[PDB]
Structures are given as C-alpha cells and as structure tokens.
C-alpha cells in the first residue's frame, strides 16, 4: 500500500521514510505530487523538488524554490527547463527588500541566485558610502574585499577587476601606512603613503595628504611635506578657517625648517616595488609579495586567501 503508507510516514514525522517511499515509486504515480506537497509543508525543499521533477512538474518544482526562497535552484531549473520567468521574481523581491532597507538581504539573494553583478554593485555602493562617512579603515577594507570577491566570482562566471581590487588596495595601503608609522619604520610608512597618493579617487584627498604630510614630518622629508601642504591648502573642499589653520601650521613648520628636499608592481607586504622578476603571487587577489616576505604570512595580506 502506497497511499496510506505515505500518510503514516507523514503523521509519524518519519520524513526519511517518506523520501525512501518517494524514491521507490515508479517514474510517474498518483502519489508523488502528494508526497511533494507534504515535503513543501514540512519545508524540505530538496526532496520536494526531486519529487516534483519525478512527477514531471517542473513548474511547481520552481514555484516551491521561489516559495521556500531557494533562488539558486529556481534559477538553475529555469535555465534547464526553459521557464526564464524568475528574473523578474528576483528583481522585484530584491526591490521590496531594498524598500525595507535590507540591502544585506538583497546581496544575500543575489549571491544565492548567482546574480553576482547586482550584489557587487550593491556592495560597491555600501563601501562608497562608508568611505564617504570616514569610518574605520579596516571596515572599509573588508567591504571592498567582499566587493572585489563578488566581482571575481562574476568574472569566473563569464568564462573591471582592476577597479575592485584597486579600491581594496587603497584602504589596505592606508592601513599598512598607519601600521608602519606606528611601528616606527618611518621610511616605509612614507614610501607607502607616496604609493597611496595615486588612489585619491577612492580615499578622500584630505586624509590622504594629511597622512602623507605627517609621515614626511616624522621622517624628515620636508620636500614632500611642502608638496603635501600645497595640495592640502589647494583642496577645494576645505573651510576658510581650516585653510587658515593649515596655512598657519605650514608657516610654523617651514619657518622651523627648510622646504627644499634632500610602473613596477607593488609588494603587498611592505609597499616597496617588486624589483625582482620572480616573485610570489596570490591565487586570488592577483597582487604579488616579495620572496623575502612571503613565508611570514599564512594568508595573503591583501585578500586573506590562503598562501600558495
């Protein structure tokens, strides 16, 4: 007996027995749709999808994935069985989620549904907002790393990364410069700040050049210090009082001391250029680290992927 046996399994909540019964039935049967409905009610998306596909009802097999929010399977089955009506489903579901300010949920669905471009765009917007907000650099670095990872996943799907990983690198080198400055290695900190000067589009210019001027002052690089205050004063997003403060501090500094001073790939570990032709390269972030500093790190400093 099949019809009553399924009911006995259901009431007994022996869902393993229900799955065994459903896989023991022939390809078609009057009972398989009922078993799949039971599975849907209890919440077993996978078993319900297999049961419906055994019934040869892909429409319901995708309607349950939509209903149970398993959008990966929904999109995959749409690609297989040629429905292609789930793109609008995902679009408006994510639109509703954004209307609820749950951008993270939208990113989660877009990652589940392999719509990696959309989630990457959302994370880029969030990272840009955080960068404008001037939050903790580590948080911005993490957000940019995740955005770049989504970009890389999209590119792997295809088979612009120079923008995503560059956005990550800007704040990574910011953090590295600050760390090197604190640790006392002033020369490396100054070199890292000079290298960071190229990413003024991501980090606000005021922070970049204030850090550069601080490194120059702490490292006796007064020529670069003057080159830093020139841009700092010339910045157009500064208040008149702030301009006066910067001018007065520069006046004091340059009355105290003289203003006159005395591309290759970049190593992630210390910001120095990678002079050697043979150098350790990451498997994900596509940015090298010098052969003399590879062994120190168990993960790639830029992207924290495993070394190898």
């Amino acid at each position: 007996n099949q019809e009553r046996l399924a009911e006995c399994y259901y009431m007994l909540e022996d869902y393993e027995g229900l799955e065994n019964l459903a896989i023991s039935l022939p390809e078609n049967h009057k009972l398989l749709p009922e078993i799949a409905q039971m599975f849907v009610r209890v919440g077993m998306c996978e078993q319900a999808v297999t049961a419906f596909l055994k019934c040869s009802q892909p429409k319901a097999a995708v309607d349950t994935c939509v209903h149970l929010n398993q959008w990966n399977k929904a999109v995959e089955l749409a690609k297989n069985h040629s429905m292609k009506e789930i793109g609008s489903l995902l679009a408006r579901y994510a639109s509703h989620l954004l209307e609820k300010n749950k951008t993270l949920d939208a990113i989660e669905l877009y990652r589940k549904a392999n719509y990696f471009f959309d989630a990457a765009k959302l994370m880029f917007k969030i990272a840009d907002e955080e960068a404008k907000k001037g939050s903790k650099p580590l948080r911005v670095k993490k957000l940019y790393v995740l955005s770049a990872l989504l970009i890389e996943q999209y590119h792997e799907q295809m088979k612009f990364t120079d923008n995503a990983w560059r956005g990550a690198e800007a704040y990574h080198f910011f953090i590295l410069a600050q760390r090197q400055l604190y640790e006392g290695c002033v020369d490396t900190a100054l070199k890292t700040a000079l290298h960071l000067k190229d990413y003024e589009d991501i980090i606000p210019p005021v922070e970049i050049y204030s850090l550069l001027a601080l490194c120059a002052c702490a490292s006796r690089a007064f020529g670069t210090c003057s080159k830093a205050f020139i841009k700092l004063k010339s910045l157009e997003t500064l208040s008149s009082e702030q301009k006066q403060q910067y001018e007065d501090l520069a006046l004091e500094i340059f009355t105290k001391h003289t203003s006159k001073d005395n591309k290759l790939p970049t190593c992630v570990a210390t910001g120095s250029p990678i002079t050697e032709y043979q150098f350790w390269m990451c498997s994900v972030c596509k940015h090298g680290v010098l052969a003399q500093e590879i062994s120190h790190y168990s993960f790639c400093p830029l992207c924290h992927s495993p070394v190898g």
């Binding site: 969030i126 580590l138 953090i175 600050q178």
Partner: protein, 71 residues
Amino acid sequence: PSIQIKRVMTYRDLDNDLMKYSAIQTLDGEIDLKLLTKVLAPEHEVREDDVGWDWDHLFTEVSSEVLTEWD
C-alpha cells in the same frame, strides 16, 4: 578598592598616553601636529591577525557591525 588607589590609577593612566604618543604627535618637541594627527587611527584598529577571510563569516561580521552602527 581604596579611593586613593583609584586616584593613583587614574593619574598613572593619564600620564601614560602623553609620553606614549609624543613620539609622533609632535615634531622636534616644540611644534604640535594635532591638526594632522586627526586622520590617524587607534593602534588596535590597524592591527590585523593572519586569519583566513571566508566570504560567509566576513559578511556576517560586517553585516552585524553595520546594523549595530546603523540606526
């Protein structure tokens, strides 16, 4: 704990920081660079330990901290 003990601890804590960060806070000891030091970050904020950053756990952490920060 003794009130005098609390006062002594507070005085030592206050005394610590000035000489702790006078190394980079000022130039040559007479010029104070408080204007430029404002863009720096706390020590512990720029410390990173070599730990694998998987997408899921990092995403959960950043989501939780964003939600705590966002209001």
